[PDB]
Amino acid sequence: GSADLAHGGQVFSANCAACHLGGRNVVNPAKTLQKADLDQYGMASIEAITTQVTNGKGAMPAFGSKLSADDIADVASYVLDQSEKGWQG
Template identity: 55%
Template sequence: MIALLLSAAAFTSPALSRSSVGKAAVQMSLQDNVKLGLAAAALAVSMPAFAGDIANGEQVFTGNCAACHAGGQNSVQQEKTLELSSLKSYLANFNGDESAIVYQVTNGKNAMPAFGGRLEDDEIADVASYVLSKAKAGW
């Protein structure tokens, strides 16, 4: 917080010194601190739960999924592609984020094997982020 005040002071008033900014930071009321804490908590809660590493997800996908799902298609069941419209129609509880994809990859279903024991949780989150990003872009 003090660093934020100092950087703001550097751009707003050359007359403000480190000591006057420091005093202002110390004099912040408890109510201001609570508001700041609540704002930070709200920001943390609103962030997506599975913001995976898409670049790593591409590597995981290439090594584990592309044999059946090259280019977002499905060589086993042609109608169950990884296109966004297909994901919406056949993934249980798909709400537009990675959670349903994570569940499917982790647990498998029908002809799709479960990767929960083969891949780490972060790898599954990464591949889910990759698949969703490609689906939204139209593969």
């Protein structure tokens, strides 16, 4: 799949930063995008992130109608990369 990290960061800024700026989670600080939280909840994979972005979960909206498959693959790759590098912001 698509794994354009820089484009993923753009998708992230346009669609995810409202709730996950800097890798946080303003709606649920127990479920951030930080490595330990992704690991805790089985979310440290492209497949898991793609599914949740596409379909939504709980208070997280779905993005499948607004974003292309490549947009979602890119943002998933961006999230996982940032979690491995330690987020900033």
